[PDB]
Write a protein that binds this ligand. Sequence first.
Ligand SMILES: [Zn+2]
Length: 55
Amino acid sequence: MQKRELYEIADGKLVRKHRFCPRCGPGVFLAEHADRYSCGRCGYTEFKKAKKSKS
Ligand SMILES: [Zn+2]
């Protein structure tokens, strides 16, 4: 049969930009790079997680 149902979504893009480093936050921002984050202080590094949305 094969049903072609590519239906989009309207999701409230909730992304609190300027995500600090939990414990270093007040005084040490989380180095936000285009591809990831890093913390020259406690070595806390995190990647810009690709938002795998169906649409
Ligand atoms: Zn840190």
